[PDB]
Design a protein around this nucleic acid. Structure first.
Ligand code: FES
Ligand SMILES: [K+]
Ligand SMILES: [Mg+2]
Ligand SMILES: [Mg+2]
Ligand SMILES: [Mg+2]
Ligand SMILES: [Mg+2]
Ligand SMILES: [Mg+2]
Ligand SMILES: [Mg+2]
Ligand SMILES: [Mg+2]
Ligand SMILES: [Mg+2]
Ligand SMILES: [Mg+2]
Ligand SMILES: [Mg+2]
Ligand SMILES: [Mg+2]
Ligand SMILES: [Zn+2]
Lengths: 77, 117, 190, 16, 86, 292, 169
RNA sequence: ACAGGUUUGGUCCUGGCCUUUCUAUUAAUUCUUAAUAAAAUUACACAUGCAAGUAUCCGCGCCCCGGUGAGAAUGCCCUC
C-alpha cells in the first residue's frame, strides 16, 4: 500500500467519485431499518456494558471477597 | 507492535488452503494484520457444507458479550453471522439482499414464461 | 490367481504351511542396504508395471497373498502381539506401497471387529443427567411467534409516504433510478 | 527498556 | 566384551536367591496390570516380621547417561533410528 | 416410591452379586509395555498392598448409569419467511464455554426455510464432540455397531468389548445405547455366556434388564451350576423388591422361608420353566451333601 | 550424576517431588544452623536435603544461609507487610521442619488444586491454531468436514479455475 | 549410537580422521501428467505502468497492510 509522501498516479488524477443511482422507495425503507437497527444494538451494547460493571464490582468488593479476605487473615493470626 | 491508535474489533481471520476457506472468529486490534496477533479467539466458521449439509459456526457467547460490553466494533460479516444465530436482530442489509433476490427471481420467472408463450 | 473368493484359503492351505511354516512371512527376508544403519524409508514399490525390481518384499514376492480385511492370520503377523502396535516398514522390509495397504487393511479390520485391540474404560460424558434445563426442553412460544407476525415490525415491507418519495427524488435528481413495489411474498421455481 | 550504551540523540529533538 | 558379558550374566542374582537372603516376599508391580501386587517368589523357611528400614533419600550410584535419557535430554540422530528385525 | 438403580439396597445386592476376581479385573492390556518395578514387602505389608487393589477395584467397578429413552426435542424459537431461499445449507450454532456444563449448552440450527429451531439429540451430540473432543468417541457412527458386525464380535465372545465401546461412543440415555445394550443382553441370554460378565462392571446392567423383563430362568440356572448360592438367593430377593405385587412375592410373605427355599418359591410360582430350576437345585443339594 | 555424596538429589524428579508452596506474602527466608553438635542434626539435614526442593517451587523467594552465628538453629521468615515469623528448631528432625513450615505459611491443598483448575481453561479445546497452543490446526482435521485439498484433491466443480472458465464463457 | 573402517611384523591400551542416518541450496545427467506447499544472490543502480482514497465542500485515513535483515550483542522473560 502507498505511503503519505509518495506522489499519486497520473491517469487517475482527474476523477474524484461517481456515486451510484438511488432507488427512492428502496433507500427510504433501508434508511428506516438502519435507524431502528442501530438503536436496538445500542441498547444491547449498554446492557452488556452494565453487565461488565456488575461482574467487575463483584470481583473487587463482593461479599465472597470479604469472606475470603477475613478467612485468610483469621487463619494467619 | 506499537500502533498510533485503532479500535478493538471482532472480525473473521482467513485460514486453510486454496479453494478451502476457513474463517476464525477472533478479536484483535484494528491496525494489526488479518492473521496477526490477537487478544482472544472466540469461535470458528466453516464456509463449506459437510456430508450432512451443515455449515458449522462456533460462538463464545459469554465472552462475545464481554468484548462488546467494553466497546468492541463488529465488521459486516460477523453481524450477519450473529444475526442468523439470533444473538442480534437481522441485519438490514441481510433483508434487502433477500428482497433483491426475490425480485430478480420473479423477473427471471416472468422472463422465461414470456419467451415460452 | 484363483484365491480372490477367499484370501484366507491360502493361509490354511498346505502350500503356505510347507514353505513358511510357523514363523511369519518376513522372518527369512533380509533387506540389502548401504551399511550398518538401514535407510529409514524402504522401496516405494517393487512391482512397477510388469517388472519385478530385484529382491522382492515378502508380500510382493508371492502374488497369491492378498491384503484384505477378511484374513486375520496374515495381518496378525504384521502386528505386535504384546505391544499391539503396527510394525513400521524397516522392521519387516515390505515396500512402502504395501505398507500403506497393510495399515489401511489393519485399521479397517479393527473397525469391523475382526482383530482385537485395546479398549480403555471410559467414564460417562456428563456428571448429572438432567433434561429439566431450558436448553433441551421446549421454551414457551413468543407472543409474536404464535400470531405469525414477524419478530420485528421493520422486518416486513412498508410502503413509504408519497411526500418522502418526492423529497428523495428532488435530493437525488439526475442520478435517480427506477423504483420498485413490494417484493413478492413467495419465489417460484424455474 | 534501556541499555548501558545509550547515545544521547539531539537532532531529533532539534527537528521537532 | 565376550568375557565381560558372560562374567556379568553368570553373576546375575535371581528373585529366589534374593528372597532367601532377605527372608522377605518380593512383589512385582506390573505397569499394565495396575496396582495388583503379583507375588513371584516366596522366602522358603522362616519369614522375617521386621520390615525393611525405609530411607527417605536412598544412597545409590546413578549413571549420568541414564538420568539424561530419563529427563529427555538425549537428542542424538542415532538413538531413535528405525532398524531392521532382530 | 418405585425402585431405582441408584438405591443403596439394589446397589449393595449387585455389589456382592458380581463378585470380585482380582485376576480378571486387572488383565494385562495390549498397550505400550514397560519394565516392571520390584520391591520387598513383609507379610503385613502384602495384605496392605492387597486391600489397596481391592479399593481400586471397587472404584474401577462403578456401574454405568442406566436411564430410559430421552424425549425428542422439537422446539422452534422463531420463524423468518423472508429468508426462504437465501441459502441452501443450514447453519448450526454451538455455545462453547469451559464453565457451562454440556447439558445446558444451546445448540440452535437455522434451517434454509428460515426457522430458528433447536438441534435434535442426534446432531447435538455430534456438535459437542467436534468442539469438545475426547478419547474413544467417533464423530460419525462407526460401522462396528451395525447388526452384521455385532454378530462377528458376538461369535468371538466380544460381549464385554461391545458394551465398553457402546458407553464410550453413545450417550447412556440415547436410543442407540439402549438398543445395543438390549441386543447384547438378549444374545448372551440365548448363548448362556453369563460367565463373561462376572467381574465386569457391566454386570449390573444385564441383571437390572433381566429383573425388568421377568427373564431370570437362564441366569439362575448358571449361578447354581457355578456353585454360587449365597448370591443366587439375593437375585431372587431383588426380584421381590422390583415386583412386589406378584404371586411369588406373596408366597415369600406367606411361607416366610429362608435360604434355598426362596428359590423354590420362585421356581414353582412364576418361573416359566421351573423343571430345570428345581432339578438343578436338587442336583446342587445332593452334590453339596456328598461334598460336606 | 556420578559426583557428589547423594547424586539422586540433583535430578529433576527430586527437585519436583518437594511440595512446599509459600504464600504470595513470603519473600525472604533466613536459615541459621550450626555445623557441630547433635542438636543441629535436623537443621543440617534440612539444608542438605529439603532446601533445593523448597527453592525450586519458589523461584521468587530469596533463600540465604548463615552458619555458626547463633548457638540455637532457627528459621526466620520475612513477609510483605514487614511481619517476621520465627521458627525454632533445636531437636526437630528433617521431616518435622517441613511439616511445620507447610502449615504456618504453606498453601492449602484445596488452593493448589483450584489454582491449576482455573489454568486449564486457558487452553480451551474449542480453539484452532498452532500445535503448541491448540490441538487442531485446521477444520479439515475434523471427520466429516471437507478434507484439505493437499491430501484428497477437490472435485472440479468446486475448483475456482473451473468456476472462472464458465463465467467467462 | 547397537556401532563400523584405519596406527603395528604382532597383541593390548590411549587417541584423531572417515563411513553408515535426516533436511536445504546450487551444479551435473535425466524428465510424462495432475494437485497442494514454497519460491531465497545482492540495504547495489533503476526505464515504464500500477500499489490511498473516501465524502454534499469540513473532515478522516494515507509503510496501517505490505517489504527487508542493513544495523545493534543487540535481547528473552518480567514489574510499572
Ligand atoms: S490444512 Fe486444512 S485445508 Fe489444508
Ligand atoms: K575408532
Ligand atoms: Mg516507498
Ligand atoms: Mg494460503
Ligand atoms: Mg513498556
Ligand atoms: Mg604405534
Ligand atoms: Mg600394515
Ligand atoms: Mg537449477
Ligand atoms: Mg502446477
Ligand atoms: Mg514483517
Ligand atoms: Mg543475506
Ligand atoms: Mg548483518
Ligand atoms: Mg558492534
Ligand atoms: Zn512389494
Amino acid at each position: 500500500r502507498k505511503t503519505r509522501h509518495d506522489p499519486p498516479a497520473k491517469s487517475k488524477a482527474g476523477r474524484v467519485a461517481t456515486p451510484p443511482a438511488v432507488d427512492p422507495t428502496e433507500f427510504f425503507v433501508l434508511t428506516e431499518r438502519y435507524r431502528q437497527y442501530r438503536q436496538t444494538v445500542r441498547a444491547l451494547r449498554l446492557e452488556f456494558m452494565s453487565e461488565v460493571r456488575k461482574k467487575l464490582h463483584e470481583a473487587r468488593a463482593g461479599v465472597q471477597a470479604e469472606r475470603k479476605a477475613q478467612e485468610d487473615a483469621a487463619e494467619h493470626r | 507492535r506499537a500502533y498510533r491508535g485503532g479500535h478493538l474489533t471482532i472480525r473473521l481471520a482467513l485460514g486453510g488452503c486454496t479453494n478451502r476457506p476457513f474463517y476464525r472468529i477472533v478479536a484483535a486490534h484494528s491496525k494489526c494484520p488479518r492473521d496477526g496477533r490477537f487478544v482472544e479467539q472466540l469461535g470458528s466458521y466453516d464456509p463449506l457444507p459437510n456430508s450432512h449439509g451443515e455449515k458449522l459456526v462456533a460462538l463464545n457467547f459469554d465472552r462475545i458479550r464481554h468484548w462488546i460490553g467494553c466497546g468492541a466494533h463488529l465488521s459486516k460479516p460477523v453481524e450477519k453471522l450473529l444475526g442468523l444465530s439470533g444473538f442480534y436482530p437481522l441485519h438490514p442489509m441481510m433483508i434487502t439482499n433477500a428482497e433483491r433476490l426475490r425480485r430478480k427471481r420473479a423477473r427471471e420467472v416472468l422472463l422465461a414464461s414470456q419467451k415460452t408463450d | 490367481s484363483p484365491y480372490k473368493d477367499e484370501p484366507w484359503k491360502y493361509l490354511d492351505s498346505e502350500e503356505y504351511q510347507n514353505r513358511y511354516g510357523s514363523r511369519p512371512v518376513w522372518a527369512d527376508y533380509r533387506r540389502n542396504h548401504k551399511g550398518g544403519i538401514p535407510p529409514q524409508r524402504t522401496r516405494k514399490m517393487c512391482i512397477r508395471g510388469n517388472k519385478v525390481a530385484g529382491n522382492p518384499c515378502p508380500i510382493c514376492r508371492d502374488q497369491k497373498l492378498h491384503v484384505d480385511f477378511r484374513n486375520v492370520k496374515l495381518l496378525e503377523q504384521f502386528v505386535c502381539a504384546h505391544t499391539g502396535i503396527i510394525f513400521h516398514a524397516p522392521y519387516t522390509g515390505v515396500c512402502m506401497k504395501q505398507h500403506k495397504k497393510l495399515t489401511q487393511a489393519i485399521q479397517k479390520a479393527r473397525d469391523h471387529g475382526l482383530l482385537r485391540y485395546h479398549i480403555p474404560q471410559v467414564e460417562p460424558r456428563d456428571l448429572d443427567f438432567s433434561t429439566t434445563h431450558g436448553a433441551v426442553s421446549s421454551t414457551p412460544p413468543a407472543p409474536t411467534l404464535v400470531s405469525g407476525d414477524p419478530w420485528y415490525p421493520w422486518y416486513s415491507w412498508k410502503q413509504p409516504p408519497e411526500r418522502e418519495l418526492s423529497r428523495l427524488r428532488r435530493l437525488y435528481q439526475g442520478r435517480l433510478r427506477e423504483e420498485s413495489g413490494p417484493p413478492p411474498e413467495l419465489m417460484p421455481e424455474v | 527498556m534501556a541499555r548501558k550504551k545509550v547515545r544521547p540523540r539531539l537532532i531529533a529533538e532539534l527537528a521537532r | 566384551l565376550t568375557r565381560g558379558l558372560f562374567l556379568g550374566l553368570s553373576r546375575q542374582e535371581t528373585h529366589q536367591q534374593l528372597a532367601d537372603k532377605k527372608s522377605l516376599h518380593v512383589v512385582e508391580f506390573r505397569e499394565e496390570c495396575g496396582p495388583l501386587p503379583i507375588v513371584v517368589a516366596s522366602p522358603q523357611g522362616a519369614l522375617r516380621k521386621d520390615p525393611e528400614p525405609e530411607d527417605e533419600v536412598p544412597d545409590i550410584t546413578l549413571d549420568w547417561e541414564d538420568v539424561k535419557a530419563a529427563q529427555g535430554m538425549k537428542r542424538s540422530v542415532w538413538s531413535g533410528l528405525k532398524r531392521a528385525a532382530t | 416410591r418405585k425402585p431405582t438403580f441408584m438405591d443403596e439396597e439394589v446397589q449393595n445386592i449387585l455389589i456382592k452379586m458380581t463378585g470380585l476376581d482380582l485376576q480378571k479385573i486387572f488383565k494385562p492390556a495390549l498397550q505400550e509395555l514397560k519394565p516392571p518395578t520390584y520391591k520387598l514387602m513383609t507379610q503385613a505389608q502384602l495384605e496392605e498392598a492387597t486391600k489397596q487393589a481391592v479399593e481400586a477395584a471397587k472404584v474401577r467397578l462403578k456401574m454405568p448409569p442406566v436411564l430410559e429413552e430421552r424425549a425428542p426435542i422439537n422446539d422452534v424459537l422463531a420463524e423468518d419467511k423472508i429468508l426462504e431461499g437465501t441459502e441452501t445449507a443450514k447453519y448450526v450454532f454451538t455455545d462453547i464455554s469451559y464453565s457451562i456444563p454440556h447439558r445446558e449448552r444451546f445448540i440452535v440450527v437455522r434451517e434454509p426455510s428460515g426457522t430458528l429451531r433447536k438441534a435434535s439429540w442426534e446432531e447435538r451430540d455430534r456438535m459437542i464432540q467436534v468442539y469438545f473432543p475426547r478419547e474413544g468417541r467417533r464423530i460419525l457412527t462407526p460401522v462396528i455397531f451395525k447388526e452384521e458386525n455385532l454378530q462377528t464380535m458376538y461369535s468371538q465372545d466380544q460381549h464385554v468389548d461391545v458394551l465398553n465401546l457402546c458407553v464410550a461412543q453413545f450417550e447412556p440415555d440415547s436410543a442407540e445405547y439402549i438398543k445395543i445394550h438390549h441386543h447384547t443382553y438378549e444374545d448372551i441370554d440365548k448363548c448362556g455366556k453369563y460367565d463373561l460378565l462376572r467381574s465386569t462392571r457391566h454386570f449390573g446392567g444385564m441383571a437390572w434388564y433381566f429383573v425388568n423383563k421377568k427373564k431370570i430362568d437362564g441366569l439362575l440356572i448358571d449361578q447354581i451350576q457355578r456353585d454360587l448360592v449365597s448370591d443366587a438367593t439375593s437375585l431372587v430377593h431383588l426380584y421381590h423388591i422390583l415386583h412386589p405385587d406378584g404371586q411369588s412375592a406373596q408366597e415369600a410373605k406367606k411361607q416366610g422361608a429362608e435360604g434355598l427355599h426362596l428359590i423354590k418359591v420362585f421356581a414353582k410360582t412364576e418361573a416359566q420353566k421351573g423343571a430345570y430350576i428345581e432339578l438343578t437345585l436338587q442336583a446342587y443339594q445332593e452334590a453339596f451333601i456328598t461334598h460336606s | 550424576p556420578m559426583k557428589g555424596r547423594f547424586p539422586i538429589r540433583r535430578t529433576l524428579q527430586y527437585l519436583g517431588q518437594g511440595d512446599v508452596v509459600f504464600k504470595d506474602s513470603v519473600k525472604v527466608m533466613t536459615v541459621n544452623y550450626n555445623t557441630h553438635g547433635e542438636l543441629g542434626e535436623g537443621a543440617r539435614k534440612f539444608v542438605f536435603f529439603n532446601i533445593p526442593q523448597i527453592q525450586y517451587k519458589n523461584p521468587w523467594v530469596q533463600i540465604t544461609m548463615f552458619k555458626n552465628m547463633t548457638p540455637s538453629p532457627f528459621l526466620r521468615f520475612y513477609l510483605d507487610s514487614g511481619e517476621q515469623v520465627l521458627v525454632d528448631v533445636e531437636s526437630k528432625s528433617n521431616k518435622e521442619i517441613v511439616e511445620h513450615i507447610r502449615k504456618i505459611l504453606g498453601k492449602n491443598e484445596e488452593t493448589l488444586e483450584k489454582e491449576e483448575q482455573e489454568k486449564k481453561q486457558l487452553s480451551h479445546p474449542a480453539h484452532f491454531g498452532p500445535r503448541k497452543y491448540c490441538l487442531r490446526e485446521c477444520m479439515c482435521e475434523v471427520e466429516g468436514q471437507v478434507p484439505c485439498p493437499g491430501l484428497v484433491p477437490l472435485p472440479k466443480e468446486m475448483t475456482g479455475k473451473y468456476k472462472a472458465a464458465l463465467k467467462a464463457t
